[PDB]
């Protein structure tokens with residue numbers, strides 16, 4: 001209360017080993033384990049890990065009362081514990097809530113770790129009982145949204161829905177309603193599951209009742225990638241891996257600046273036209289959400305980010321081309337984007 | 348380019364002393380100096396500073412090509428250099444661009460340090476030559492905006508305006524136009540300076556030409572505090588110090604959630620009514636902008652932050668009272684806020 005919140009220097013991150021990993025597991029609600037190889041002998045690698053340890057130490061302090069634990073499993077000194085716990089990807093964070101395990105693959109900053117783990121602490125299903133709560137659903141525009149209308153929470157169909165909610169927690173939100181009155185506002189019947197793709201006004205309905213736990217999974221697996229995706233720090237690396245033939249379409253637009261405000265809606269219209277093109281993965285990167293990568297992007301691509309930008313980035317060749325633009329000239333329309341997209345299939 | 352941006356472990360922060368501080372100064376465009384007392388003998392204080400050093404080390408890596416340097420002046424081993432450089436506030440960061448010196452007093456995270464220093468690297472005066480650029484000015488709603496219409500940049504009146512711009516760089520933005528056509532869109536004559544208070548639609552004009560360098564300062568000094576202020580990480584501590592008789596009015600509203608979207612406009616109307624009340628400092632805190640302080644606020648005040656909240660916080664007594672609210676019930680209007688403000692002057 002009165003104590004101002006600062007990093008107190010108290011070590012909290014647990015050196016997991018074969019003796020305590022059980023006690024540690026049965027101790028915290030959610031346990032975050034960083035599976036790391038031993039840092040090299042040199043002073044620089046020691047400092048890279050020195051920061052990783054601290055970034056976790058700051059998160060361990062923030063989520064102490066919230067029942068979130070942090071541990072470091074050494075790929076060699078704790079090789080046994082990692083084998084049993086199913087720890088494969090070295091230099092990566094695994095998150096354990098109940099039985100489902102999460103291979104965290106976002107940015108490793110104390111900000112993003114905590115927000116992600118806070119979103120892990122809540123329930124997978126987020127119920128709606130009011131219009132003020134139903135208005136929030138209608139505002140979701142930046143990621144994959146899912147809605148399921150059930151008669152009751154105790155019903156068996158909704159019991160397989162929460163089980164199908166844990167497999168994607170918390171990267172894509174799963175909502176559920178038990179009101180028939182809102183079921184008509186969403187064109188959703190009883191046990192009818194609607195699917196909202198990211199940045200898509202008109203949704204896509206899923207097969208009628210019944211829907212098994214295995215059923216709900218396989219549809220998202222086919223539609224996890226939206227035509228347009230916002231780059232989020234909690235998953236910026238899994239998103240960047242998911243490209244089309246080593247080719248990403250990337251849009252630099254600040255959601256706040258008016259130049260970018262129309263640039264996002266000009267962009268979202270392009271994906272509305274070519275959503276029948278599964279080979280089209282375009283990624284919107286809010287520069288206000290990645291302030292540490294701004295000077296590196298401006299230098300790698302020779303651009304100014306104060307002005308919105310768009311181009312094609314080759315992941316395989318590590319090459320990029322960027323639409324030259326004039327700030328005084330009018331912001332190019334969606335026709336000028338696909339006309340410039342004609343120079344994408346030329347090579 | 349191809350190298351993925353990670354903290355490389357290379358130490359960059361300079362141990363400033365009496366031998367190199369001149370060479371260091373004449374080396375970087377902007378030099379950030381952390382004036383710190385020597386950490387205590389114990390292992391916890393050593394780790395608190397261990398993180399402070401790293402948070403700077405990450406910023407030194409990001410702004411290396413951008414000509415930004417970082418240094419640690421020890422209040423005892425570099426006591427001479429601190430005396431000459433005018434370093435008074437211990438455990439605080441000083442920023443040196445040219446001759447004006449900045450006592451940085453925001454949050455000490457690598458995110459905020461870099462954005463602040465990037466805003467330091469640009470010019471104090473941000474010129475407008477287009478409508479796309481003039482539309483950005485009209486979108487500024489969260490802080491103090493200033494506009495000055497001059498005939499030419501080479502003019503003497505605009506030369507004292509850039510000199511009056513450095514004294515407030517970069518906490519409040521100073522714009523300047525040389526177009527007479529936009530001067531009519533802002534009700535601003537030749538050498539007429541208009542002042543936009545934060546969250547205030549109708550601005551307030553400043554005395555006509557001439558305006559000295561000393562003149563521009565003293566008006567902002569009287570009007571630096573807006574009736575309503577957004578809590579920004581780059582200055583969250585200077586803002587929290589600036590209270591009214593140990594009393595802050597604080598609003599917890601997420602700018603994205605629809606519940607908070609109307610809660611901010613309900614709030615901004617209240618300040619529009621009582622802007623003639625200089626004793627009224629209310630602070631809006633975007634919970635999406637301070638993710639590390641969320642579990643501490645929810646515990647200190649016994650609230651849920653998913654729902655917007657407002658109350659009165661006593662800085663002197665370290666006490667607070669919060670408007671009890673129902674999520675199903677309608678979001679209280681601006682009349683219910685001042686009616687609940689009646690219970691502020693009762694004690």
Ligand SMILES: [Ca+2]
Pocket residue numbers: 015016017072073074077078
């Ligand atoms: Ca171990």
Ligand SMILES: [Ca+2]
Pocket residue numbers: 197226227275276
């Ligand atoms: Ca699609």
Ligand SMILES: [Ca+2]
Pocket residue numbers: 362363364419420421424425
């Ligand atoms: Ca020294």
Ligand SMILES: [Ca+2]
Pocket residue numbers: 544573574622623
């Ligand atoms: Ca005022």
